Amino acid sequence: PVALHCGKLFDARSGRVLGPHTVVVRDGRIDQLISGLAAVDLRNRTCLPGWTDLHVHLGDESSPQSYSEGFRLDPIDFAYRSVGYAERTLLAGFTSVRDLGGEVSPHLRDAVNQGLVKGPRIFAAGKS
Amino acid sequence: PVALHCGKLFDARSGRVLGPHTVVVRDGRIDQLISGLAAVDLRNRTCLPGWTDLHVHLGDESSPQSYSEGFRLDPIDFAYRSVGYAERTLLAGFTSVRDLGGEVSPHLRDAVNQGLVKGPRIFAAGKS
């Protein structure tokens, strides 16, 4: 249970930036929204809903050696990179993503859901 | 049948450069060697026996992409390069070589012996 005090709130549904509000969070869901318990001082910030990226590939990254690494590396080697990929994606403000290709992403989603590693909520497509 | 007129001849066995000589060739072998028929004017050159390279790999050549080409190319693709490799080796003065690795070299040797392509006499090792 925590109360967030924002100086400005972005209304996604109406697309307008409102004034100061207070958000009360209990059991991982928004419980109350007051216009006007632990507390976080955000009164000098703008609060928005977490962003969603609808096209990512968390199991890979482009590089000069990406066209010869597939014949020498294993997916287990790519998982250890995906750890940092997912952490960096989450810390940038994207709380959920849609993974659209790759067999490493379902396993990363399971690990993130079990709390083993940090990352966003993953909707994985698997093999294209 | 041709007669070669050299201004100087290198005696490999004694390791000394002799004076003008005449070499008569019949049936692919040296028939006569005279110190002092078709004719070739070499009187302003030094004649030596053909050279032998005891370590070559005629089926390949080093390049920046040589560590990723093996997974995308076939030996048939390497034969077409070996054609030029063998021609360039022969035209440089090396009439015979010892190939010490590679499965393309026995086929190149057979093709050269049958007269299909130009090259040196190949003693091929095959797979190491």
UniProtKB/TrEMBL annotation, chains A, B:
Zn(2+) 2 binds at H55, H57. Coiled coil: none annotated. Zn(2+) 1 binds at H55, H57. Disulfide bonds join C6-C47. It comes from the Bacteria. This is Imidazolonepropionase. It comes from Pseudoxanthomonas wuyuanensis. The chain holds residues 22 to 156 of 428 of the full protein.
